[PDB]
Amino acid sequence: AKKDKAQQVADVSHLLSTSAGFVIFDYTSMSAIEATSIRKKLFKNGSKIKVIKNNILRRALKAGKFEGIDETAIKGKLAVAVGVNEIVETLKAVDGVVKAKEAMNFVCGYFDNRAFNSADLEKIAK
Amino acid sequence: MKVRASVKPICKDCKIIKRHQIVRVICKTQKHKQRQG
Amino acid sequence: IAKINLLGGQAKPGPALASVGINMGEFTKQFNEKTKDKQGEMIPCVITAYNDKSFDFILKTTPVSILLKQAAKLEKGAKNAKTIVGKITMAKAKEIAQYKLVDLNANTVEAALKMVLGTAKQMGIEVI
Amino acid sequence: EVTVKVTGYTDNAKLAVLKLYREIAGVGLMEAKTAVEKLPCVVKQDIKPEEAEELKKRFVEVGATVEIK
Amino acid sequence: KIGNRTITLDPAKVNLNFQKDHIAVKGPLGQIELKLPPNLPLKFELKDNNLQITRNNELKQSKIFHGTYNALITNAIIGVTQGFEKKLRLVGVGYRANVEGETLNLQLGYSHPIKEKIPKGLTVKVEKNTEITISGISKELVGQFATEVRKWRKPEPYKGKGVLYFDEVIVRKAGK
Amino acid sequence: MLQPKRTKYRKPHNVSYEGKAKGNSYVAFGEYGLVATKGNWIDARAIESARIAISKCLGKTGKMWIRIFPHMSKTKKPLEVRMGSGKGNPEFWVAVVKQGTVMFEVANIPESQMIKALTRAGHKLPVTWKILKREE
Amino acid sequence: KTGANFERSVQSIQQRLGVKAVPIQLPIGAENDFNGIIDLIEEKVYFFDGGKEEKAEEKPIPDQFKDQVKQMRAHLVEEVANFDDQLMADYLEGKEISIADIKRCIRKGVIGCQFFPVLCGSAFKNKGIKLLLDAVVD
RNA sequence: UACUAAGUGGAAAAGGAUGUGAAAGUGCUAAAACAGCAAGGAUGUUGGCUUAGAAGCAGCCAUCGUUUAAAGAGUGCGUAA
């Protein structure tokens, strides 16, 4: 119920706090085959790939001590690449996937909490 | 459009309409539709 | 798009594949020489439905859904899971699961073994 | 993927190179001749290395400058 | 739901006046007229950039009124600001159409000439002999007119030859 | 089809089906059951038609029990005869059911196919059937 | 006749058989407006007769289809370019080859089964069969 | 004071029904639940009898697992599979 919602909000907020790097990106017609391909690209990598509920997502990023309180966790299939622990490999892989398609919808987040544009991200990661 | 006395949904689409206060059973196909069933 | 699985001895069989828009001799020779090391066996192929359709065909390793009969040293894949047909050592099953680990959604050898057990459920013989 | 492009001809065999461009897939006289009249012209793309290797083999057997990847 | 269906008003040129039997909608695409039924327990209040309707009682038919009149107002607005159109694909061998004045006459399967009258507010255009576009003024008028056009001949499951609405498909039946 | 062994008298009263359930007034052996909302008479042919319907829709397993056995019999007075020569000629056997009587019970292949089979059985008899579940 | 589409025929021949059939002459009209032929070997020939062929109307090739000829012309000699190298030299030069020469080349092709010509006409309308007879003789 | 939409009243049933109204309950949700819509809706896997193939799904017999938020040897339609 909502108590479990709050408990999971606290858990994922703590996970985000200890894993300072986390970036959320949405993409059009999210197919299962391409999701499997990108997930297999992050083999044995802590980052998780899913879509979580928008309400619980906004509550989590509210309680996650992260940039913003409720900004973009609405209006679209909220694909989430929850960066966990090491997020350099995750950052490079998700950015390569972003450049792979026509354009991936930059929702929010950063590689270690201090927002910069993705053009800056692809060059700092390099 | 069949005539019966016990309507039961045979196909996926076997909906009913009391159109002009007269009951017609209709289906996506032209065969499974009914009348006064 | 459909799935296909046929003999590796020759890619010439299959009229549906030749009618996609790719020359018969093209994929025939290409597959037959890409499987020249090991052919004359059942192999699952995958191809797409492209407009130009010059060559968009690739193969996969030998299917593992009823292939445990190869490891079970028997044939006649059972319809019903009522009796057991034989025994397979767990070492070989785990080695095969690792051998097919990279292919599928499984990310560790254990998940591939779970899938092997799931597909062996029907056969009547489980991972033993 | 590896492709092959025909550079400057040898023996100036316009007929022969036109037939070479025809034998790739069974193209007609008009399009093949227009392609040949342009010195840079790709034969085919999206093919495996072996068949492109035989394509280049024919191209060097007939005789012409050959550009490949 | 539709009992709670907000209709935004565009007073740029689309202005609505109410007579309890005639609702007039002025806009760029001519003018729409809605024949309000008599003695309605529903109040259709116009306001700033929005239109709100509310029943003054609690009746089963009042909910149907709430849905239907909201639907009618929405259709009137969209018609007076954009209108509606249909694309008709006439799949045949010798089948074709051409218009003279207000009479569209046809070359179809009968040995008899075919003619039909075109109502006002429904502009038809025949680019190629087998394609027609019908830009209507209301979904009711255009739908009924399209049904009248297709009632002469319709495609069959054995063969598709007739006035397709450019969005339908047929099945295949064995013709020996 | 289902008849008694010996009959000391072949000619009882005509029959009356009035009254409420006296014996077998409930379901006591199955998991689902069928009850009659009105007292009627069930002859051999309809009983066998219902039984074969149940057997066909039962599948491979399924346990069924009738709460009664066809006991009563009917007589037919000769046709095109004038009034009064005795009684009728003995005829088919029949079972009497009263208003509100549970007649049949099922188990083994549960409630989905149970209700399907019960409908199959009841669609052969004039009685306005009523499906129930035996409670434990 | 309804359904007699020139494109349908000239595509179906190659799809079903692929015999490199060369369409020589071009019609004028589509099953109702059929009124003559755009000759390739010679100038256009109008046929106003709806039956019982008696006269052929010699006319210059229509302007809007000159290019329609040229492409096919640039193919037709090219289609008989598989017989000699001098024809290819002329094609490179762009020099026109004599109509009699290309006619004999098509004759050699058809008798040798290298290719086969295609002509148009309607039996119920009797248009352009004199062209067929001329081709048969030549 | 409730009901009517059948002129039921003002003849009849086997039957069937989101007909109407009332009552007794049972769950979630304004964070926006449900309907619709923009989508995805996947792999081992075309499991085997067999239809001069078993292939998702003529049918028949088993009737699981992996990632996922999601996917059922599949929910069905439908295809020669």
Given the DSSP bridges, would you call strands G117-118 and G22-23 parallel, antiparallel or unpaired?
parallel
Statement to judge: residues E29 and E94 lie in one domain: no
Under 8 Å between Cβ of G68 and G75: no
Q: CA–CA separation, D30 vs D34, rounded Å?
A: 6
By CB atoms closer than 10 A (0-12, 13-18, 19+), residue C24 is: middle
Helix and strand numbers (H, E) in chain D are 3, 2
Classify domain C66-127 at the CATH topology level: Arc Repressor Mutant, subunit A (1.10.10)
Instruction: Indicate yes or no: CB of C105 within 8 angstroms of CB of A36.
Output: yes
Statement to judge: residues E46 and E88 lie in one domain: no
- A50 beta partners: A80
Q: CA–CA separation, C42 vs A28, rounded Å?
A: 38
Smallest Cα distance from D47 to chain C, Å: 6
- E47 beta partners: E50
Closest chain D residue by Cα to residue C33: D50
Nucleotide nearest to A76 (CA to C1'): H38
Q: Which residue has the tokens 């019903």?
A: C80
Closest chain D residue by Cα to residue G85: D15
Residue F95: closest CA among F133, F39, F135, F50: F39
Give pairs for A86-90: CB < 8 Å, separation 24+. A86/A45, A86/A46, A87/A19, A87/A21, A87/A22, A87/A23, A87/A46, A87/A47, A87/A111, A87/A112, A88/A21, A88/A125, A89/A42, A89/A45, A90/A21, A90/A23, A90/A42, A90/A45, A90/A46, A90/A47
- Nearest protein residue to nucleotide H34, judged by CA and C1' positions: E1
Nucleotide nearest to F119 (CA to C1'): H15
> Phi/psi of residue A45, each to 5°?
-120, 135
Under 8 Å between Cβ of E50 and E104: no
Q: For residue E23, what are its two tokens? A: 């609702």
C33 touches chain D (CB under 8 A): yes
Statement to judge: residues E105 and E160 lie in one domain: yes
E38 touches chain G (CB under 8 A): no
The domain tally of chain E equals 2
Q: F63 by DSSP, 3-state: which?
A: strand
Closest chain D residue by Cα to residue C27: D48
Q: For residue A124, what are its two tokens? A: 């700092």
Question: Which one of E39, E66, E82 terminates a domain?
Answer: E82
CA of A85 to C1' of H68 (A): 21
| Longest alpha-carbon distance in chain G | 45
Question: Has residue E19 been placed in a domain?
Answer: yes
Q: CA–CA separation, C24 vs F65, rounded Å?
A: 67
Residue C90: closest CA among C119, C111, C116, C67: C116
Q: Which residue has the tokens 């077998």?
A: F24
- F131 beta partners: F34
Residues of A in contact with C107 (CB under 8 A): 43-44
Tell me which residue range forms the domain holding A86. Answer: 1-125
By CB atoms closer than 10 A (0-12, 13-18, 19+), residue F48 is: middle
Q: CA–CA separation, B9 vs A59, rounded Å?
A: 46
Q: CA–CA separation, A92 vs E41, rounded Å?
A: 64
Statement to judge: residues E34 and E73 lie in one domain: yes
Residue C114: closest CA among C70, C64, C80: C64
User: Testing the interface with E: which of G1, G2, G5, G8 to mutate, by most E Cβ within 10 A?
Assistant: G2
B in contact with G (at least 3 C-beta pairs within 8 A)? no
> What are the residue ranges spanned by the domains of chain C?
2-59, 66-127
D45 touches chain C (CB under 8 A): yes
Question: Has residue E159 been placed in a domain?
Answer: yes
Question: Has residue E155 been placed in a domain?
Answer: yes
- Nearest protein residue to nucleotide H36, judged by CA and C1' positions: E1
Residues of C in contact with A44 (CB under 8 A): 107
Alpha helix segments (H runs only) across chain F: 44-57, 111-122
- E162 beta partners: E91
> Phi/psi of residue F69, each to 5°?
-130, 140
DSSP string of A107-123?
Answer: EEEETTSS---HHHHHH
Q: CA–CA separation, G80 vs G103, rounded Å?
A: 10
Residues of C in contact with D43 (CB under 8 A): none
Classify domain C2-59 at the CATH topology level: Ribosomal protein L11, N-terminal domain (3.30.1550)
Under 8 Å between Cβ of E5 and E59: no
Statement to judge: residues E113 and E154 lie in one domain: yes
Nucleotide nearest to F129 (CA to C1'): H14
C107 touches chain A (CB under 8 A): yes
Q: CA–CA separation, G61 vs G72, rounded Å?
A: 14
CA of A114 to C1' of H72 (A): 44
Statement to judge: residues E129 and E62 lie in one domain: no
H/E element holding E17? strand E15-18
Under 8 Å between Cβ of C127 and C113: yes
Under 8 Å between Cβ of E155 and E173: no
Which bases of chain H are under 7 A from a protein CB atom? 5-6, 13-17, 19-21, 28-29, 31-33, 38-49, 55-56, 60-71, 73, 76-77, 81
DSSP string of A64-100?
Answer: TT-S-SSSSSSSS--EEEE--S--HHHHHHHHHHHHH
Q: CA–CA separation, C117 vs C128, rounded Å?
A: 9
Q: CA–CA separation, G46 vs G57, rounded Å?
A: 5
Q: CA–CA separation, F133 vs F33, rounded Å?
A: 6
Statement to judge: residues E102 and E154 lie in one domain: yes
Q: CA–CA separation, G54 vs G124, rounded Å?
A: 14
Which residues lie closer than 8 Å to F112 by C-beta, 6 or more apart? Answer: none
Given the DSSP bridges, would you call strands B2-3 and B34-35 parallel, antiparallel or unpaired?
parallel
Q: Which residue has the tokens 């699985």?
A: C5
CATH number of the domain at E121, please: 3.90.930.12
Cβ count within 10 A of residue F71:
13
Tell me which residue range forms the domain holding E92. Answer: 84-165
Smallest Cα distance from C112 to chain A, Å: 14
Question: Has residue E8 been placed in a domain?
Answer: no
DSSP structural state of residue A43: T
Statement to judge: residues E94 and E72 lie in one domain: no
Question: Has residue E9 been placed in a domain?
Answer: no
